[PDB]
Structure formats: structure tokens, C-alpha cells
Design goal:
Assembly: dimeric
Strand content of chain A: 5-15%
Keywords: bacteria membrane protein, membrane protein
Largest interface: A-B, 18 and 18 residues
Chains A, B: Low pH-inducible protein LpiA
Number of helices of chain A: 29
Distance between the termini of chain A: 29 Å
Strand order of the largest sheet of chain A: 8-9-10-11-7-12
Number of strands of chain A: 12
Radius of gyration of chain A: 30 Å
Oligomer: homodimer
Bound molecules: the ligand CCCCCCCCCCCCCCCC(=O)OC[C@H](COP(=O)(O)OC[C@@H](O)COC(=O)[C@@H](N)CCCCN)OC(=O)CCCCCCCCCCCCCCC, ligand PGT, 1,2-dipalmitoyl-phosphatidyl-glycerole
PDB class: membrane protein
Entry title: Cryo-EM structure of the multiple peptide resistance factor (MprF) loaded with one lysyl-phosphatidylglycerol molecule
């Protein structure tokens, strides 16, 4: 149920469920000694750990076929070594993090926009993949719970009829969903409206997801020493444990997975064995895949060669690996050894400080900063020679030295400067910090219960991290922005002079992005305007400025050519609508398929309707007639005015650009703003105007003459309007859409008919051009679209 | 591995495996009392039997989706209530019988040729279905054997490594088969050459076959009272028990299924419970589906309405139901009750006699006789009022009275007369009789072991059944057959006068079929010749005459219009090749796409090559030149002559039909036989003749003039040659073909180039016409095609 959590109480409720889960871990693990857990790790039958490596390998092979199946569903057949990597390194993170910037979403985006998909199709790949895992895990858990409510029924002393009956309830619900969605037929089960694929496709997907959950239950089943349950009893436990640990949005499914397995198997087998198998499960299944995903980038970077997809995936992988590294550092700083460096109960507080600093550096590394690289490299080095002095500890030292190795290797990857601390907060990284802190508190209360200042110090360090986490332009800038609009390309940005939109610049001075702030996030207007080389340097700087004041950097109507370095900044693009573009050198007045426009023009030829080519100083002759016709087209919509879209009643902006008129053979009845550039390379309009002198036979010639004059000056093409998205592309959607995409199309049919319908643009036979809205920080474009909307109105 | 058993040692080896299995049943059931088994049937918790009915219902719902999936694979989308019936009544028989006339094969044929498929596609439906069940049962048993070699490992005291290792062996073999057959690529694993379908199709098929085997293991698992194993342990037992009971070709998988489950679960649970669950399994899963399949025909016959498919399926269903009825009669005659009608150890021998008589009547009813109806109806009535007098016995009396009800209902279904006993033997019905006899011997040795004349009497009755199972035409007939060729239609049958082919007739006198005998089977030549109404009456009479001398009634080159009542007789059609037909009223000498023939004719115009229109009495001028040119075209192939195909060196047959010649401008160098009828409705040729005066430029005009003269007399069309089957239709094949179809195509490219290649026929631009060979008795067309072949040569 992605893009439905619209809150910060989701961030609070996630760590609430983790607090309840960790309290239940400490409840269910009373009479176990930490020394006994260390004993059971040190004696664990190395054939069993090798077999756990084998089953993790089979699990990630099935995850590769999840995604290859997804790409065969939407027709986009991509080559296989560029899909094995982008879904062996999408589940190496998705099994670890579930945040905005670190999830399956913001890695499929960053690894497929570089690879060659369309952002209207990565939201099909992601959505089919997440329906695949969720619905397949529900079917698999409810079928393997159906066959055995007796091998696991009495283990929690719940009778076999009830545990089987809830599995029959889940299977009846999912059979109802499939039988509703037999042939198309989007079935609205609530907010989310599933539209299941072919029966030949969800069955292949069900095999792939059942082999995934089988070879990921068997990783833990080989590590549990000689249970009183078989394989499938443990498989029905595992498909409830994962089925709740991913249901509660916790990072990696940490606490809920742990507490379900401890609550289920402590009655069966010895609790030290289950803790020693769960810790050695989290290592083998959630850290070894990160290490292999890192090394298969770094080795190919040193030395067939997939350096582009490695360059787009390495910050995400390192930022998801540093978070588990920080969990390991804090959990191994709190658990004691006798010989400790009292460097001058407060001497291992340096190590916990380094661990929390490196997960803050992980939040930096996903944002791909430079201070993140310095802090993470040096903090890992300090942890290296302040943890190697104690013992050998090949897991700790080797894993952390691998982090240092990779992070020295990827220095040339990124040099982007910003302030590591001055970004305020996301909904997810607070959950990361708080899960590390609360898990550390539970490790401390767990360990020193059999045999403080360090506890109070770790809590005070976490509170200091929380406090540090808590821690229109001048007419010269507007005129210089107008000069940048002149001396460069796209003429869409002639909405620059109307004010109300803050304008930042670049260091080169010839590039700008135009703001606008509505809620907890400020948006943009068209696209960064300027030469090509100043745009990617500025597309990061915008988002850095947006996070610098604790806001999200939504975009609006961006180009498909922008995507290749738009998605690198952490921008989930979304399909919005297509912008009608008519090339002018490939145009004829009737041709074979333009004569409807010729007859509509000749409808106004007999009226003799005319035009104006007037100047930026030709205001004082027209202005009160402009006021009265403004009253008319405000009476057309019955008095509701919009910003961010058109030019309002403006004494300067209306007379700013050269405009053009519909006449009463000399008397102004309707006008039109025309928007050019100095470079003569592209021109546009924005507004059409109604009169009580123009019926449906003359909704065109006021604009047809403008098209002919823009042909007459010698422009290359012409950006007329922007249309909402058609019914055939409302057909091509994804399974787990919700009210989000419906209100994308409602925003389409709500704000894009103030100039004309899609068929009205189609009357001019245009070649369409898609425009997107990019959203920062992995948040819902329900929120982003409404932040655009309430800034329109 | 169908169409590879080519023997009677398969029939011997099947009952050998059943003898070993029944001896192992009697071995493993020493200390069990028959009274205790009756106790455990009478106390069996009626909720458990209702739940077994539910799981049988789910199993046959999945069997319906086996076949609906199969019909969606080959594109032929058929309506669903005509597929639910023809695969709820194809597995109601296939789970009971595995013979020639009673299997999935000879019910898919009889229920799809009526329904609307092509016999080149029912051999795709059948073959995809049998690969589906076999390969899916192997994958399912090897996967559910993989997860648990510990819940069922020590039950037979075999260590868990070996039972898991053979499952890894099976899964590695099947993964090798799939990875070989990724994209097309027919992988020859031996005699059988699997070519697996789409990954989107065998996965859906794997779900359907795993839900089948799950809901058929659970029918028996609900009947076993409180095992020491879970569900999936019993599922891994069941997928070995079925996986060997269908591997050994035994009817219903009787003895092998029984002995595997007794051998596996007698060590776990009490043996009386396993016998009481296996008998009540065979009832619920193999007799209740026959009863429902019968009643859903008979009720719809009395009263939406599918009377055609019921009329084609009811004899197969009744003949597979009477066999289990006979097993029940013999097994309930041997098992004793105290009060018995001593009508005057030999008074219940009447009941065993009635049971063996009714399974002989079942062999009659599949062949759809009339004495079969009389013997089966009256023998069931005698069993009714000589078994109802003993006790109530609602299962026995109700089941048998249902048989009497259905068989009175289907009197109007069939009235076909033949001798019920005088058919000699099939490979399968001897296995039916012998499995009933040996199972009866084991029931007798089982029951009277705790506490004979009846045993010796049952053995003598079976030996009497075995002994009773052990129990060119005149020139008037040839000339009358030539008169039937004259006064009626197809001119293919002008091979009638050459002798060597026995000619039977009909009772109406104006219809005939022409024999030819090679091995243990005699074949036919073209098609029954005559009016339409005398053909279906004769198409049964041919097969009755063939079984009357203990032989199989193969056909050769039959029409697609014959299939609708050809498949009713029990004739598995097979695609053979297409017969080139050129309509003459829709023909032009060059048109747009015939001018190659015009230029090839003008190649011989400058030679001035000519023809003959000579008579049946114009022999004595040409005959020695015919002898020398016969020496030439015997020197063409280098001296190897064929029967059954053309006219040989014949003093009567060569001069019989009007022939036509290639000349040395008057001197005979090459001839051609031309074949007409009196009705002027269709004409043909058979033989083209080589000369040492005709190169590749004149392989045509000798025949082109014949085509023009057959146009000139005024015929409708022209049966020139018969071509082998093309490469695109050697592409459209089925998965479990073997050397059979390969030698069908080898027979094609081996015997059909003595007149010309497929492109040689394509030079004349023909409209193709498929011709089939029908095979009786469910036997392989390897055998039938070679019986045609060694009668050609
Ligand atoms: C207590 C009562 C509550 C019940 C109410 C149920 C309502 C359900 C409504 C649906 C809301 C879903 C919201 C989640 C959205 C989200 O968060 O995003 C999408 C997610 C990520 O998918 P992602 O791509 O990120 O992959 C993640 C993989 O890595 C996981 O990782 C790990 O946890 C690893 N440790 C293990 C790896 C495993 C193999 N790789 O997918 C989803 O749809 C999640 C839906 C899951 C639904 C499960 C339903 C419950 C199952 C129980 C079965 C029946 C038995 C009942 C007995 C009680
Ligand atoms: C002891 C060592 C020997 C091993 C050697 C293996 C070689 C295999 C070579 C393959 C030859 C196949 C020859 C059969 C051909 C034939 O006869 O015809 C095709 C059949 C019918 O198909 P049909 O359409 O007729 O349906 C039938 C349904 O009704 C059955 O009925 C019943 O029995 C009911 N009582 C139950 C209904 C169940 C649900 N409905 O299908 C086939 O391919 C048969 C192939 C089966 C292959 C199984 C392999 C072994 C499985 C074991 C798994 C691994 C574990 C190993 C541990 C030891
Ligand atoms: C009700 C089920 C619902 C549907 C789910 C069905 C899914 C089945 C698919 C399972 C595939 C993976 C199988 C993993 C099973 C592990 C079995 C196992 O326990 O391993 C034992 C031994 O394993 C081996 O010897 C090697 C097994 C290798 C399995 C390789 C699988 C290949 C076949 C997979 C099928 C798919 C083929 C394509 C693969 C890409 C070790 O156990 P143990 O004796 O150590 O246990 C005692 C105690 O627990 C302490 O350990
Ligand atoms: C390792 C596995 C390999 C792959 C196989 C996986 C296939 C799983 C699919 C199974 C579907 C059918 C499930 C049948 C399980 C039967 C469970 C059972 O035992 O029934 C119990 C109770 O059953 C019920 O209460 C009702 C169960 C109804 C199940 C209906 C299945 C619907 C869901 C099927 C999934 C598909 C959905 C579409 C269906 C067309 C009765 O047991 P008991 O307590 O009597 O046992 C004690 C002793 O044995 C004596 O009996
Ligand atoms: C081991 C498995 C053994 C048992 C498996 C039972 C399944 C039988 C299928 C048999 C089968 O394939 O028949 C197909 C049938 C629907 O087919 P339709 O006629 O709708 O297909 C028409 C078109 O889809 C064809 O293109 O399925 C059902 O009727 C509902 C079954 C629900 C079964 C419960 C849920 C099963 C898993 C759902 C997973 C969804 C994943 C979504 C990913 C996008
Ligand atoms: C519960 C099940 C849980 C585990 C299921 C494991 C299966 C994973 C599939 C994952 C999957 O679908 O990937 C598909 C992949 C092959 O796909 P391809 O790349 O060849 O597909 C290309 C074209 O087929 C696409 O049209 O399968 C394999 O590599 C071999 C798998 C063997 C698995 C063992 C045998 C499985 C059953 C075979 C049944 C054959 C039935 C034949 C009927 C005609």
C-alpha cells in the first residue's frame, strides 16, 4: 500500500511497533545468557552456514527472475546482466531499508532511467514487483498455513481450526480478487485498485515468489539446529514473520520478524539457538548480499564492465550498507568484552558515537554528499583501529574494512558538496536512528540483566542527534533571468516576469530555476533554463537548497531529456500529460490533413478578423478594453482565478510580451499572449481568451493566425498548450495504483481545459511531447501534485 | 511414454507388476483381520468422508483447468461447459482405465472430433496434457520430497540423505530439460523428444497440476485417521504412489498404489486404518466421479442440453464404470457373510461369474455392441436381486442400481449388432481380466487366512474366459465394385481393378471398403465409396469384420469429412499429408499466377509433344513399348517395385482405364494413367512416367495436357498426387511425440516423391486437402504405418 501513507504518524507508528516488538523480545528472552548465544554462534556447523549461503544465492536468483519477469510483462525486453545487477542490488537494499531514498522504488528508478526505460514504465515494474511480493507472500503463507495448522498450531497453543480458518479467509479473499480481475476489470478493494495481469503471468510470478520465500525460509531453517518442526512448519512461520515484518514498514523488518520467530519457536526449541540463528540469519541474508553487490561494482570499476549502472547504484548501496554497519557498531559497542581500551563505562561510548555518526553519514551518502564521504570514511577508519585492538573479530573487522575499501574506491564517483547536518529530517531516517537507538537500549537491558553511564550516554547522544536533526527576488535578478530567457532556448519560461516565483541562479550566472512554495515543500515551474552544461550542476543545487530549509523539491512539466540526470538527484518522475508541439517547417495550410483548419480560418475570413503585433510599450491604447474582456472571461468560468498557470490581470506582465488580438474589425474583443525568445529557436503561447463575439466556429482563428505568424517569423516549432493524458494511456497502467494516479488524471482534466481539450489541440495535428513532474525524497505525488494545485489556486 | 510400448510383453509385464504388488500387499498385511477393516469403514467420521468429497471436487475442478489450459495453448478457444464435461469424463475414465479404448486418449478423440477440433490438434491436447501430468507430478513429488526426507525418511528406515538426493537428481534432470527447451529446441531425451511450451504456460500448468495432486492427496489424507505424519509428508508419499501406479500402466494404478502406501504407512499407523482408507479412497475418488459423470449425461438426456457430446461419451463412461462394478462384484462375492443363498462353497460362484461376465460386457460396451447391452443389463439385474436379498448394502445396491438405471436410459443410444465374444483380444482387456482375477485371488488368500472350491471355481471361470477369448474376391464382386465406382463420386477408388485388395460390401449393395492385410491387422485404401447414407453403417461393419478375425482396422488417406463418424468407431486419426486438388472452373492458363505452366507448356509446343485419349480396348498397339518404357522407369529407381500405390506391369489394369501418352511425335516414350468416374463429378491420375526423352524442362507437359483435358471434359476438380507435410506443419507439433511422428514424416518424404515433390505439386497452384490414416484400438501408428509400408513394399 505505497503512496497511501501521508503523514509523520506513520514514522511514529513504525517505531512504536518496533518498540512493542523489542519489548516482546526482551519479554520472551528472559532466561537466556548472552554468553550462551556467543557459544551457539561459535559452534554452528560450518556446513550449515555454507548451506545458508547456497539458499541465499538461490533466493537472489529468484529475485533476479522477479524483475526479469516484470520486464517481460510490459514488453520492454532488456539485456540480462543489466537486470541481474539492478535487482540483486535492489533487494540487497530493499531487504535492509524501506525508506524514501533507500527502497526498491528509488533504486529501480535510478537504475532504469539510466538503463533505458520510461518513467511511466518504471512505475509499472515497481508496482508489479510489489504486488508480486505482497500478494504472492500472502497466497504462499495462506497456503502453507492451510496444510499445517497442526505442526505449528499447538506451538503457540492456538487450536488448529482457527489458524487454518484465517488461512481459508486469506485464500478466499485472494481468490475473490483474482476472480474479480479475470479479464482487465480494475477491482477497487479500497484506496488501492488492483488490476491483476494475465493468468499466464501471475502464475509464473507466483512460482518465482514461492521459490523466493522458500529459499529465504530455508536460509533460517538450515541455521536453526534440529527443530521439533519440519521444513514446511517453519515455512509457515517464516511467511507470517516476513508477512508482518514487511507489513509494519520497519527497516529490514527487524523487530517484528525477530519477535514473531522468538514468540513462535521459544516454546519449541531453546531460545539461545533461535537468537543465534536469527543473528546469523540477518548477517548471511541481509549483509552478504550487500557485500556481494558492492564488490561486483567495485571490482568491475577497478578492472564485463557496467560502470554507468554501478555509478548510479553505488551511493544507494553504500548508504544501505553503512546503516547495517552502524547497527553492528552500536550493537557490538554495547555488548561487552573484559579487556577494553580505557582511553579517557564511558570508553566504549566513542564506538557507539562512531556508529551513530556513520548512520548519519549514511543519510548523507544516499543524498551523495562530500562531507558524507569524509565522515563515513574517517569514522569507519576510527572504528577500524579502535575495534581491531580488542580482538581479531574477522566478521566485524573484515566487513568494516570492506566498507573502507569500497568507500575509498568510490571517491571519484562523487564530489558533490553540501552540509551534512543542515538537512532537517525525512520520515524514514528518523525511524532508522530511532530503531538503532531502541534496539541498542534493548541490547543493553538484555545483556547486563544477568551480571548505566553508558546507557545514559547513548541516550544523550541520540537526543543530541535529534536536536541537531531539528537543526520576490530583486528586479536585477528578474531582469537578468529575462536576459537568460532571451539568450537561450525554450520559450516556455516566459512566465518569468509575472513575479510570485523566487528565482535562484547558478555560479555561471546563465542558468536559473524558478521556485514556488506552498506547503512543506517548494516546487518548480518548467525546467532549468540555459545551456546544457549548466543544467546538471544546477539540478542538484536546487534540491540542496530545498533540503537546506527542510522542504521537498517537487518539479512540474519537465522534459524527457532532463530525466538522465534528473533521476540521479533522487527524483521519482511521474507522467503528467503531453505538450502539443507543432513543427513549422513541416507544416502546410491544408496539405492533406489540415483543411479543417483552412475552412475554420475561412469562417473568420468572411468576418475579416484581424490581429496585433504590438510591442512591450504598446499598452495605453488597449488596457481598459483588456479590463472589460478580462471581466468577460472571468464571467466565463464564473469568477475563479488561478496562479502558476497563466497571466492574470497584470499592468506589466500583460503588456510585457508581444500579444495578439481578436478584433471587432479594430475594436478589441479577445487577445492572446505570445511568448518568444531572442534566439528565434522556439516560440509559444499560454492563454486563449473568450469573447461574447466568438462562437464555437471561431475558437480557432485567434490562435490560427498566431500559428501562421510564428511560422512567418521563422521558428522551428511551437509549444501550444499542454493536454491531459489520453484514455489509451489511462489503460496502460500498473496494478497497485490508488487515488494518486486517479488524481493525476483528475488534475489533468481539471486544470488543462482552460485553454482547450485534447481533441482541441489535436485539431492542429500536433506531434506530442510528454512532460513529467519530478518528486524528491520518495514521497507521494498525491502530496506533490496538491502542493502544485494549491499554488495554482 | 505413449506410442513406444509395441508389444504383448507390456501386457504381460503389467500384470507381472500387479502380481508382485498384490503379493507385497498380502506380505505387508499379515496381522490384520477383515472384520477389523469392516469396523474401520463402519466407523469413519462422516465429516471426513464429506471432506473427501470436497477435495475430490477440487481435484476434478483442477482437471477441468488442465484441459482448458491445454485448449488455450493451441489457440483453439472452445466454450467451457463443453470442456468441463469432456475432462470431468476423461479423468473419470483415465483414473480408472489405461487401455486402448478406455484412456484419456480415446475419450479426448471421441469428445473433440464431435466438438470441433482437428485431429492434428487433439494429438496436441492429449500430448500436452500427458506431459503436464507426468512432468508436473515428477516435479511436484521431487520438490515435496526435497523439503522432507525426514518426516517420511525413517518411516521406511531409509536415511534422509538418500531420499533427498534422488529428489535432487529428479529436479536436476527436469531443470536440465527445461533449460534445454528454453526457446523451441526439441530436446531428444531418448525415444521421446520433448519440446516444452512457453515459460508462461508450463508455469500455469504447474499450478494446475500441483493443485490437482494436492487435492488428490488430501482425499486420502482426510481418510487416514490421525497419522504420525503431517499433510506434506503424506503428500510426498502420495506423489510417489501415484508416480509409480501410473508408471506401471496398471488399470487405475491399482496394485502399485496400494502396495506403496501399505509399505510406507504400516510402519507408522495401523494397517487396518490404511486399508479402510484406501478402499474408501478408491470409492470416493474413482467411482463417485464416474457416477457424477454418468448422471450429468443421463439427467441432461432425460430433460443446458449437451446430448451430442453425451452420445459420444456415454459408451466410454459406461464401459469404464462396468469394469469397477465388476471389480466390486468379484471382491464382494469373495468376501463372506454368514447368511448366504445356497441356491444349488459354490453358491456365491454365481456372483463372481456375473462380475466377470459384466467386465467382458464392459469390453463389449466400449466397442458399443448390442449383446453387450443385453448381457450387461441382465447380468447387473441378476446381481441386483441376488445381492439385495442378503443385506441392505447401500453402496453395492445403489451403485449397481445406478448402473442399471443408466444402461436402461442409454438403450436408444446404441443398437449396433456384433458378436460379444468373437473379438479375440486386446493388449489391455487381458490386463483388466487378469487384474480382477489376481486381485480376487489375493482377496481370497487375505480373508480366509484367519478362519477352496470357490477359489478353484473362480480360477476355472477365469481360464474359461481366457479360452473363450482365444475363441482376391470374385470377378463379379470386382466388376460390381467398378460399377459402384462408376455410379458414384470420388475417383480415387479407380485402383479397384488391380486386384490384391479384398473388397467387402454393404447390405445396400452400393458401398464398399477395400481391404489389404499385412501383419496382425488389415488396412484400407481410400475411403468407403458410395452415397453418404451407406458410409457410417459400413464404417462400423469394417471394424467389426476386422475384430472378427482378430485384427486391427487401420485406414489410409481418409477424408476430413469422414472424421465425424470415423472417430466414433474408435479410430485415432493421424495427419499424413495433403492431397493436391485443383478446381477446374476456377482455372486459367496463365491468369496472373499460372504463366510458369504456360512457358513450360510452350517448351513442349516447339517439340510438338502429343497425347492419347485411348480406350479400355486400345491395348495391342502400345503394349511392348509399354514394357520397354516400364524397364526404363524401373531403371530410374534402379529396380524396386511398390504395391498399394500405383499400377504395376499389368496386362489388364494398365489398359483398363483410359491412359494418355508422351510421344516421339507418334512413338510412345512415356505414358500416364487417367482415372475418371461415370458421374463426371471428379477425376484423377496416379502415375507419372519418366523417359530418356524428357528432361527437367518436360516433367510437366505430359501432365499439363491431362489437366487441360480434364478441364475439357468438364470436371469439377482434380486429385493430383498427394504430398508430404510441409515444414511449417512439422513445426506445429506436440511435446511428447517420438519416433512415431518422425517416421510419419519419413514415410511422407519416402513414398510421396515417386510422382513429385511438394513444390512440384505447388507448380500447378493447388488448393490443398488433408488426408488422414485412422487407427483402430488405440495402438501406435508406428505399427499401423509400417503395416501400410510393408504392404506397399
Ligand atoms: C496483524 C494484522 C494485520 C493484517 C492486515 C493486513 C493488511 C494488508 C494490507 C497491505 C498493506 C501493505 C503495506 C506494505 C507496503 C510496503 O512496505 O511496500 C510494499 C512491500 C515491499 O515490497 P519490497 O519490494 O520492498 O520487498 C520486500 C522484501 O524485501 C521483504 O524484505 C524482508 O522483510 C526480508 N527480511 C525477507 C525477504 C523475503 C524474500 N525476499 O511489498 C508488499 O506489498 C507488502 C505486503 C505484504 C503482505 C503480507 C500479508 C500478511 C502475510 C501473512 C500470510 C497469511 C498468514 C496469516 C497468519 C496470521
Ligand atoms: C522404480 C523406478 C522406475 C523409475 C523410472 C522413471 C522413468 C519415467 C519414464 C516415463 C514413462 C511414463 C510412461 C507412462 C505413460 C502413460 O501411461 O500415459 C501417460 C500418463 C497418463 O496420464 P493420464 O492422462 O492418463 O492421467 C493419469 C492420472 O489419471 C493417474 O491416475 C491415477 O493414478 C489416480 N489414482 C491418481 C490421480 C492423480 C491426480 N489426478 O502420464 C504420464 O506421463 C505418466 C508419467 C508419470 C511419471 C512419474 C515419475 C515418478 C514420480 C516420482 C516423483 C519423484 C520421487 C522419487 C522417489 C522414488
Ligand atoms: C507447503 C509448501 C508451499 C509451497 C512452497 C513449495 C516450495 C518448494 C521449493 C523449495 C526449493 C528449495 C528447497 C530448500 C529445502 C531445504 C531442505 C533442507 O532442510 O536442507 C537439508 C539438506 O540440504 C541439502 O543437502 C542440499 C539441498 C539443496 C537444495 C537445492 C534446491 C534445488 C532444487 C530447487 C527447485 C527449483 C529448481 C531451479 C532452481 C533455481 C539440510 O537440513 P538439515 O538436515 O541440516 O536439517 C536439520 C536441522 O534443521 C538443522 O539444519
Ligand atoms: C511441499 C508442497 C509442494 C507443493 C504443494 C502445495 C499445494 C498446496 C495447495 C493445497 C490446496 C488444498 C489444501 C488441502 C489441505 C487439507 C488440509 C486438511 O488436512 O483438512 C483438515 C481440515 O480441513 C478443513 O477444515 C477445510 C479445508 C478446506 C480447504 C479448501 C482449499 C481452498 C483453498 C485452495 C487454494 C486454491 C484456491 C482456488 C481453489 C480452486 C482436516 O484434517 P484433520 O484435522 O481431519 O486431520 C487429522 C487426520 O488426518 C484425520 O483427518
Ligand atoms: C503450489 C501451488 C499449488 C496450488 C496453486 C493454486 C492456484 C491454481 C491456479 C489455477 C489457474 O491458474 O487457473 C486460472 C484461473 C483464472 O483464469 P482466467 O480464466 O481468469 O484466465 C483468463 C485470462 O487470464 C487468460 O489470459 O484462476 C482462478 O480461477 C482463481 C485461482 C486463485 C488461486 C489462489 C491464489 C493463487 C496465487 C495468486 C497469486 C497472485 C500473484 C499476483 C502477481 C501479479
Ligand atoms: C511451489 C513452487 C515453488 C518453486 C517453483 C520452482 C520453479 C521456478 C520457476 C522460475 C521460472 O519460471 O523461470 C523461468 C526459467 C526459464 O525461463 P526462460 O528464460 O526459458 O523463458 C523464456 C521463454 O520461455 C519466455 O516465453 O525457468 C528455469 O530457468 C528452469 C526452472 C526449472 C524449475 C524446476 C521445474 C519446475 C516445474 C517444471 C514443470 C514442467 C511442466 C511442463 C508442462 C508442459
Amino acid at each position: 500500500l505505497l503512496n497511501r501513507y501521508r503523514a509523520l504518524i506513520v514514522a511514529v507508528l513504525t517505531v512504536a511497533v518496533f518498540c512493542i516488538a523489542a519489548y516482546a523480545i526482551y519479554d520472551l528472552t528472559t532466561e537466556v545468557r548472552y554468553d550462551d548465544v556467543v557459544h551457539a554462534l561459535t559452534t554452528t556447523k560450518i556446513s550449515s552456514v555454507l548451506l545458508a549461503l547456497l539458499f541465499t544465492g538461490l533466493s537472489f536468483a529468484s529475485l533476479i527472475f522477479y524483475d526479469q519477469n516484470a520486464l517481460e510483462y510490459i514488453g520492454k525486453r532488456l539485456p540480462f546482466p543489466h537486470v541481474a545487477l539492478t535487482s540483486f542490488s535492489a533487494y540487497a537494499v530493499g531487504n535492509t531499508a524501506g525508506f524514501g531514498a533507500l527502497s526498491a522504488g528509488a533504486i529501480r528508478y535510478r537504475a532504469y532511467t539510466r538503463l533505458g526505460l520510461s518513467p511511466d514504465d518504471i512505475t509499472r515494474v515497481i508496482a508489479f514487483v510489489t504486488l508480486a511480493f505482497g500478494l504472492g507472500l500472502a497466497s504462499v503463507g495462506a497456503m502453507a498455513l492451510l496444510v499445517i495448522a497442526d505442526e505449528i498450531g499447538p506451538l503457540i497453543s492456538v487450536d488448529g481450526l482457527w489458524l487454518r480458518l484465517i488461512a481459508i479467509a486469506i485464500l478466499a479473499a485472494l481468490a475473490f480478487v483474482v476472480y474479480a480481475g479475470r479479464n482487465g476489470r480494475e477491482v477497487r478493494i479500497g484506496p488501492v485498485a488492483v488490476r491483476l495481469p494475465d493468468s499466464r503471468t501471475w502464475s509464473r510470478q507466483f512460482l518465482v515468489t514461492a521459490f523466493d520465500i522458500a529459499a529465504s525460509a530455508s536460509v533460517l531453517y538450515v541455521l536453526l539446529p534440529e527443530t521439533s518442526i519440519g521444513w514446511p512448519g517453519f515455512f509457515a512461520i517464516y511467511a507470517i514473520a516476513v508477512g508482518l515484518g514487511v507489513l509494519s514498514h520497519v527497516p529490514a523488518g527487524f523487530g517484528v520478524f525477530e519477535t514473531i520467530i522468538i514468540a513462535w519457536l521459544g516454546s519449541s526449541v531453546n531460545e539461545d539457538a533461535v537468537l543465534s540463528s536469527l543473528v546469523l540469519y540477518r548477517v548471511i541474508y541481509n549483509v552478504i548480499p550487500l557485500v556481494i553487490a558492492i564488490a561486483a561494482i567495485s571490482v568491475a570499476e577497478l578492472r564485463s564492465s557496467m560502470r554507468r549502472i554501478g555509478a548510479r547504484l553505488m551511493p544507494q548501496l553504500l548508504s544501505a550498507f553503512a546503516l547495517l554497519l552502524g547497527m553492528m557498531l552500536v550493537f557490538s559497542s554495547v555488548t561487552p568484552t573484559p579487556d577494553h581500551n580505557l582511553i579517557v563505562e564511558s570508553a566504549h561510548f566513542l564506538s557507539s558515537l562512531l556508529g551513530l555518526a556513520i548512520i548519519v553519514a549514511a543519510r548523507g551518502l544516499s543524498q551523495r554528499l562530500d562531507g558524507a564521504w569524509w565522515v563515513s570514511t574517517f569514522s569507519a577508519l576510527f572504528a577500524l583501529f579502535f575495534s581491531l585492538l580488542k580482538a581479531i573479530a574477522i566478521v566485524e573487522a573484515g566487513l568494516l574494512a570492506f566498507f573502507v575499501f569500497s568507500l575509498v574506491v568510490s571517491r571519484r564517483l562523487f564530489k558533490r558538496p553540501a552540509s551534512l547536518l543542515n538537512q532537517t529530517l525525512t520520515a524514514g531516517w528518523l525511524t532508522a536512528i530511532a530503531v538503532v537507538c531502541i534496539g541498542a537500549i534493548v541490547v543493553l537491558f538484555f545483556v547486563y540483566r544477568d551480571v548505566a553511564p553508558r546507557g545514559l550516554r547513548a541516550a544523550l547522544g541520540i537526543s543530541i542527534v535529534s536536536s541537531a536533526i531539528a537543526i520576490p527576488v530583486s528586479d536585477d535578478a528578474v531582469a537578468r533571468a529575462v536576459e537568460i530567457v532571451r539568450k537561450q532556448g525554450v520559450a516556455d519560461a516566459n512566465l518569468v516576469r509575472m513575479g510570485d516565483k523566487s528565482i535562484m541562479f547558478s555560479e555561471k550566472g546563465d542558468a536559473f530555476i524558478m521556485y514556488g512554495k506552498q506547503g512543506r515543500s517548494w516546487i518548480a515551474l518548467f525546467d532549468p533554463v540555459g545551456p546544457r552544461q549548466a543544467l546538471p550542476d544546477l539540478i542538484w543545487r536546487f534540491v540542496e537548497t530545498a533540503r537546506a530549509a527542510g522542504c521537498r523539491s517537487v518539479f512540474y512539466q519537465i522534459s524527457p531529456a532532463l530525466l538522465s540526470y534528473c533521476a540521479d538527484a533522487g527524483l521519482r518522475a511521474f507522467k503528467l500529460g503531453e505538450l502539443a508541439v507543432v513543427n513549422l517547417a513541416n507544416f502546410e495550410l491544408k496539405g492533406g490533413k489540415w483543411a479543417n483548419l483552412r475552412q475554420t480560418a475561412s469562417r473568420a475570413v468572411r468576418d475579416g478578423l484581424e490581429f496585433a503585433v504590438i510591442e512591450p510599450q504598446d499598452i495605453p491604447d488597449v488596457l481598459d478594453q483588456l479590463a472589460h474582456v478580462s471581466d468577460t472571461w472571468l464571467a466565463d468560468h464564473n469568477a475563479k482565478e488561478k496562479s502558476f498557470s497563466l497571466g492574470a490581470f497584470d499592468p506589466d506582465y500583460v503588456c510585457s510580451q508581444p500579444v495578439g488580438v481578436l478584433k471587432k474589425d479594430g475594436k478589441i474583443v479577445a487577445f492572446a499572449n505570445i511568448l518568444m525568445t531572442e534566439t528565434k529557436e522556439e516560440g509559444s503561447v499560454d492563454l486563449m481568451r473568450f469573447s461574447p463575439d466568438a462562437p464555437k466556429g471561431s475558437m480557432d482563428f485567434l490562435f490560427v493566425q498566431i500559428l501562421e505568424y510564428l511560422k512567418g517569423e521563422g521558428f522551428q516549432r511551437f509549444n501550444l498548450g499542454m493536454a491531459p493524458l489520453s484514455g489509451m494511456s489511462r489503460r496502460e497502467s500498473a496494478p497497485v495504483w490508488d487515488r494518486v494516479g486517479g488524481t493525476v488524471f483528475e488534475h489533468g482534466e481539471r486544470f488543462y481545459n482552460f485553454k482547450g481539450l485534447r481533441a482541441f489541440k489535436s485539431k492542429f495535428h500536433p506531434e506530442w511531447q510528454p512532460r513529467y513532474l519530478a518528486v524528491s525524497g520518495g514521497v507521494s505525488p498525491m502530496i506533490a501534485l496538491m502542493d502544485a494545485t494549491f499554488l495554482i489556486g
